[PDB]
């Protein structure tokens, strides 16, 4: 649980005679062993927005598995016309990715992984594509159970 932020944005809506500059923030929090959650929340000042985002993130976590410290099979993260590629790197190479990708993967307590952005690069879509790719991943035990070849084949 390091709750590293990724990007704060000075968003604003317009009202008669003035601008409601209400900057928000996106945060990623991870137990470093499988718990991952992200929080986007809007507030008038930094610390309260940070607290709201952390509460939203830690409220809704979810688990993920470890295969030699890394993903084991190919996947493409399809989310809102923004693809991110994940490849099962060999053990030694270590983490290599951008800002949000490194945030998500390291906060997941992973290791070696091969990454490359495709299409857009707005952080929220990056996070969505990465989570969708990481969760649509099937475990070999799960596919083995639904197969008749569960005996390591």
């Amino acid at each position: 649980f390091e709750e590293r932020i990724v990007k704060l944005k000075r968003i604003s809506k317009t009202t008669k005679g003035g601008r409601n500059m209400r900057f928000s923030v996106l945060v990623v929090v991870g137990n470093r062993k499988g718990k991952i959650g992200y929080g986007i929340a809007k507030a008038l000042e930094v610390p309260n927005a940070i607290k709201k985002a952390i509460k939203a993130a830690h409220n809704s976590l979810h688990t993920i598995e470890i295969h030699k410290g890394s993903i084991y099979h190919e996947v493409i993260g399809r989310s809102g016309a923004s693809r991110v590629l994940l490849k099962p790197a060999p053990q030694g190479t270590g983490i290599i990715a951008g800002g949000a990708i490194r945030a998500i993967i390291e906060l997941a307590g992973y290791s070696d992984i091969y990454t490359k952005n495709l299409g857009r690069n707005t952080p929220i879509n990056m996070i969505h594509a990465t989570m969708d790719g990481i969760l649509k991943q099937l475990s070999p035990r799960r596919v083995a159970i639904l197969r008749n070849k569960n005996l390591n084949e």
């Binding site: 030694g92 270590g94 290599i96």
Partner: protein
């Protein structure tokens, strides 16, 4: 240039003792603020990944007395082989002749030890040396040339020296040996070598 102007300022901003523990040990009321006219309050406001990664890089190469391009060459050479990255890189950096002279404890500082090495005062495996970038391997024997022992600066270090278990020495005969590779926890750990090693995507 291969030599640096001031050393305590480096420990000031880097926040890492260039010495064992006496870099900021209240020497003349030693401090820990960043140097320059603006040490009042720049605590942590723009702590980015790139900033701290540069911080660990400079920490890694200031206490070794290295410069950029040769450090890049060292990283490439250690990347040439097979194994784990950070520990092998640190092994190569601890295979430097002057660093092993410092670990011998024969000189009070790495700068004096480096001058003694350059000036021919150091003889390795019955061979004189003039290159501080020689690569030492396990089971390599070292002596003090059996010459120019009459130095006031080498003595008080020679008797008073911390014999780390990874390099053994004989005080009176001034003989040393690089037997086993130093371990990660054996050497100062105020340096996060990982941020350095994956700070290089150069190749």
């Amino acid at each position: 240039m291969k030599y640096t102007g001031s050393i305590f300022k480096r420990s000031r901003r880097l926040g890492f003792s260039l010495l064992e523990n006496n870099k900021e040990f209240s020497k003349g009321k030693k401090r820990k603020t960043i140097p320059g006219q603006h040490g009042n309050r720049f605590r942590s406001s723009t702590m980015s990944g790139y900033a701290q990664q540069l911080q660990e890089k400079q920490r890694m190469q200031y206490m070794y007395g290295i410069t950029d391009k040769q450090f890049r060459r060292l990283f490439r050479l250690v990347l040439k082989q097979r194994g784990n990255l950070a520990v092998n890189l640190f092994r190569v950096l601890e295979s430097r002749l002057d660093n092993i002279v410092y670990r011998m404890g024969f000189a009070p500082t790495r700068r004096s030890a480096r001058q003694l090495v350059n000036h021919g005062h150091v003889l390795l495996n019955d061979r004189t040396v003039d290159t501080p970038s020689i690569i030492l391997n396990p089971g390599d024997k070292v002596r003090l040339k059996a010459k120019t022992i009459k130095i006031p600066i080498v003595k008080a270090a020679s008797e008073s020296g911390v014999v780390s278990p990874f390099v053994e020495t004989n005080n009176k005969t001034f003989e040393g040996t690089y037997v086993r590779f130093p371990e990660r926890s054996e050497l100062p750990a105020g340096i996060n070598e990982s941020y350095v090693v994956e700070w290089y995507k150069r190749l």
